[PDB]
A paper describes a structure:
Using Escherichia coli MsbA, we show that peptidiscs stabilize this ABC transporter as effectively as MSP-based lipid nanodiscs. In particular, the cryo-EM map at 4.2 Å resolution reveals that the peptidisc preserves the native conformation of MsbA as well as its interaction with its lipopolysaccharide (LPS) cargo. Image processing revealed subtle conformational variability in the distance between the two NBDs, as illustrated by the two final density maps at resolutions of 4.2 and 4.4 Å. The slight mobility of the NBDs in the nucleotide-free state is the likely reason for the somewhat limited resolution of our maps as well as the previously published cryo-EM map of MsbA in nanodiscs (also 4.2 Å). The final model was obtained by docking the cryo-EM structure of MsbA in nanodiscs into our 4.2 Å density map using Chimera, followed by refinement in PHENIX. Like in the nanodisc-stabilized MsbA, our map showed clear density for LPS trapped in the transporter, which was not visible in any of the X-ray crystal structures of detergent-solubilized MsbA . However, unlike the EM map of nanodisc-stabilized MsbA, in which the nanodisc is seen as a large amorphous density, the EM map of peptidisc-stabilized MsbA shows clear tubular densities surrounding the transmembrane domain of MsbA that represent the α-helical peptidisc peptides. In the case of MsbA, we identified a total of 15 and 21 helical segments in the maps of conformation 1 and 2, respectively. Most segments run almost parallel to the membrane plane, with tilt angles of less than ~15° for 8 and 14 segments for the maps of conformations 1 and 2, respectively. In the case of MsbA, the protein in peptidiscs has a higher ATPase activity than in detergent, as was seen for the protein in nanodiscs, and it does not adopt the artifactual conformation with widely separated NBDs observed with detergent-solubilized protein.
Numbering used by the authors:
A (entry chain A), B (entry chain B): 11 to 580
The structure:
């Protein structure tokens, strides 16, 4: 199908696959030859009692089987090359566009889901399609050869096995299709009953509150009867596969033997020949069963790969040309802005009109649980501006190249991630360049992480173990403020709540904060009164419709939603 | 192992596994018999040229394979019985004690995680251990047969295979242990690197701000290279698994043939016998690879069983047998209460001397994240009384058990899980018993469920899809208040935050509240603005020290954290 959309991502490796095929064919070649050894064994060897060949057989079997091995060795190792390399390029592009997809892919889908997707689906594509080639080629080496085996030994028994191969293969395809059907149509009710039990368990809370234990026991019981019965049918039918197959398959043997009379009535065969024939037939029965499942495996793989491609074929954050940005801007403004964090149910914000000029410290007071961080996250333009504009010193949203834009903002939230690295360089995500070690380490110490730098393991370049070891929320917050001291955003913002208070820590923190905000705006998530009033100014968060522009210095004289932020909302 | 702990849960089905055994032993009998049948063909059939047996035998093949079939039929279906029955009983007890873990114990795992645990671990236990018995019995039977087969043929090659088969077994056990070791060590570092990439993902926003797409791509690349390499090593070894084994088996075949030449110096065999020998040997080569991984397989099963039994071997919620609970008003009054919602994740509450007399309406305002519901939900003792008891009408909570207590109180929250029944009954999960369908349905529609229950599919006794829960949060709360109206627990507590709902729906819900708050106690999660005061009594709490709350009169009397809240902070 869509191997096209894959072949490039295989192409510059294709040579490897080729290698595979070669030995792979040899592999099943070995198979045939082993069986071939029967011919000299039985008729030529024991019939003529030529103890000569009885010295061939041992050694040649050993050798051939070693060939089977060394093939399997290299087949596996080489398909491992290509599979790994395919996984590699796949996860690479996926990584890339992932870091290109807007916050949606993290909004609509959860991290665990994506990571499962990467690892499982990539390696599934690889594994599946690979094994597809493996079987396919393994079947080619086996079937085709075994027919040639028959050929030299007996035109007749061959002819018959050939004319019958359609019958058996068709029967296999038939039963497989039947029982795919029976195993597909189930999934609906399968998920039905499973998810039913799921809701049961999710509701045990309300259950026990309402004292329905006796009821939900019986409900569990009934749905579990449904469960076990479903399982019964599933395994029953799907297990009828092998019998009927080998049943109808066995008939083959019958005809062969049934019609083995006449050609031995022609005295065509001798014992060894016959043994080779029937052996070979069974050998054939391994890959015949395989082949239908082969097409199945293509389907599984390429399906998951289409899931992939969709995740790729999703579109990154779109930009329209906005290059006009440096590291000193000063003011931000919100005209008539709307956003929708959810799908459509709860409007996030609406016709937001805000104005944070230089130095205007701000603390988010308003609709508790309106995702106040969103407004900051809107300054990040993490979302697309459904209406209005962010006039950041006279220029609109779209006169703002995303690169320098997001470079020009700093956020120190409560919960900060880092990466497994020298914590110093983790501060230095800003290319670790254009900020020298003196700058980095000194300022970082100067930025009040000193008990987290000099006292921690290895002091100056304290390294991370398992991504920050056990660094407190406060540790990471300090580290981010140190980043701010390093990056020195033209506009500096952060988020601190009522989590914890170590006097020196947050005191020197807020000191550095007002250092940053010197003639520079700032926002902080407001749940602490201490952070609210230790700085100068405090704002509204007008409950979805923020027409209000300004802090205490502005929203004090107006007597706006400060009524609610005094008595009814905060 | 823990079979001691599981056998009884199988005992009353013994006969199943017994039929399993007899059938499977027949399966091996069929295997062996066909292989035996191979002889008369070769020695008598074509050697002595007796078309008689050329006619007899083919039919025998058909028959024997029919036996294979029907046996696999019954084997599968019988193991299906026992497996399903085991799954059933297991899931049943797991439901039972799964109704015993405290709500935390419910959230100590994720709901989905426990559901996976039920479904998977149950069917894993069965499937695994069952197939273990399958392998043991069948494969052992095939071995024993094939040895007997050899015996009817030749003392000699038998003896030699008996000397050698242990060595084969040794090689297999050896390589399996080596590569289990390698796989475990990998698994460790595997988790390391995979979780590393996981974190790398989970922190987009940080990077997209700090603009390090290059840095990620590089780190992604390195860790993914590690990934491909681990893949390489894993598949490499696990693939070397087979060929060495088959090489050793090859060595077997070889020395078999050497000591076939030597009793050919004795003129040992005839063609048929010869063909039977090695054929049988390979037939054996399937089940040895079986048996080793067999003694492996229990562990997977029995491991997940231990997981299960532990989930059983948690303690159902403690009880006090105090009982003596009025189905009447009583008086709800916190005293000295100091608890914690999680194990220790976050500090919750301290010294709660809260008094709510009979009929005193209360709201829940303040620390957004103080588990205001958890106060109510702990009137239900969702956790234990860590310190400080609630004197229920002169009786501590500890002075009484949970049974009627939890029945004696109601809680109309925002999100009431419903269940797959005639939703008319869904109101009365506990003991639909003489409760007049007139009374039930009226009170429901009397309780302003009428907005939709009048207009739901089939009218009075409607169900819907998804367990009859297709209703919105609005109809959810509606029917919940209706439930309160059915049980009419003279103890009344509710939970509505009218910050979020439609206007007309809100009109209906407030009217219904009026219809239900007749002289009755009341609490409400107050993230609301207006309906906080429709009942004229509003209050607030932070800091987890609830000594002061209650009516508006009590709001006026706080003069501590809470008066300061409703006058400056909430």
């Amino acid at each position: 199908q869509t191997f096209r959309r894959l072949w490039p991502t295989i192409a510059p490796f294709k040579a490897g696959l080729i290698v595979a095929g070669v030995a792979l064919i040899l592999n099943a070649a070995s198979d045939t030859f082993m069986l071939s050894l029967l011919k000299p064994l039985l008729d030529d060897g024991f019939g003529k009692t030529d103890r000569s060949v009885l010295v061939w057989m041992p050694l040649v079997v050993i050798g051939l089987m070693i060939l089977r091995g060394i093939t399997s060795y290299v087949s596996s190792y080489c398909i491992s090359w290509v599979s790994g390399k395919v996984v590699m390029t796949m996860r690479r592009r996926l990584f890339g566009h992932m870091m290109g997809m807007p916050v949606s892919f993290f909004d609509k889908q959860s991290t665990g889901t994506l990571l499962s997707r990467i690892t499982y689906d990539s390696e599934q594509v690889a594994s599946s399609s690979s094994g597809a080639l493996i079987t396919v080629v393994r079947e080619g080496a086996s079937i085709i050869g075994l027919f040639i085996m028959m050929f030299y030994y007996s035109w007749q028994l061959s002819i018959i096995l050939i004319v019958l191969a359609p019958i058996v293969s068709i029967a296999i395809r038939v039963v497989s299709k039947r029982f795919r059907n029976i195993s597909k149509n189930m999934q609906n009710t399968m998920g039905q009953v499973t998810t039913s039990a799921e809701q049961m368990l999710k509701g045990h809370k309300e259950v026990l509150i309402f004292g329905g234990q006796e009821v939900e026991t019986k409900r569990f019981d009934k749905v579990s009867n449904r469960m076990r019965l479903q399982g019964m049918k599933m395994v029953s039918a799907s297990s009828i596969s092998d019998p009927i197959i080998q049943l109808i398959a066995s008939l083959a043997l019958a005809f062969v033997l049934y019609a083995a009379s006449f050609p031995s009535v022609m005295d065509s065969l001798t014992a060894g020949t016959i043994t080779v024939v029937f052996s070979s037939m069974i050998a054939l029965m391994r890959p015949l069963k395989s082949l239908t499942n082969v097409n199945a495996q293509f389907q599984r793989g390429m399906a998951a790969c289409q899931t992939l491609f969709t995740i790729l074929d999703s579109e990154q954050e779109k930009d329209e040309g906005k290059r006009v940005i440096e590291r000193a801007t000063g003011d931000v403004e919100f005209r008539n802005v709307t956003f929708t964090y959810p799908g459509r149910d709860v409007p996030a914000l609406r016709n937001i009109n805000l104005k944070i000029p230089a130095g205007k410290t701000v603390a988010l007071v308003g609709r508790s649980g309106s995702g106040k961080s969103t407004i900051a996250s809107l300054i990040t333009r993490f979302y697309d501006i459904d209406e209005g504009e962010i006039l950041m010193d006279g220029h609109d949203l779209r006169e703002y190249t995303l690169a320098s834009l997001r470079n020009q903002v700093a956020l120190v939230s409560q919960n900060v991630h880092l990466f497994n690295d020298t914590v110093a360089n983790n501060i230095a995500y800003a290319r670790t360049e254009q900020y020298s070690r003196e700058q980095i380490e000194e300022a970082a110490r100067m930025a009040y992480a000193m008990d987290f730098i000099n006292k921690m393991d290895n002091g100056l370049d304290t390294v991370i173990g398992e991504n920050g070891v056990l660094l407190s929320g406060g540790q990471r917050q300090r580290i981010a403020i140190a980043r701010a001291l390093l990056r020195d955003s033209p506009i500096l913002i952060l988020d601190e709540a009522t989590s914890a208070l170590d006097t020196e820590s947050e005191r020197a923190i807020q000191a550095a904060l007002d250092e940053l905000q010197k003639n520079r705006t700032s926002l902080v998530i407001a749940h602490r009164l201490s952070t609210i009033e230790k700085a100068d100014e405090i704002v509204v968060v007008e409950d979805g419709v923020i027409v209000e522009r300004g802090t205490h210095n502005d929203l004090l004289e107006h007597r706006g939603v400060y009524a609610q932020l005094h008595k009814m909302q905060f």
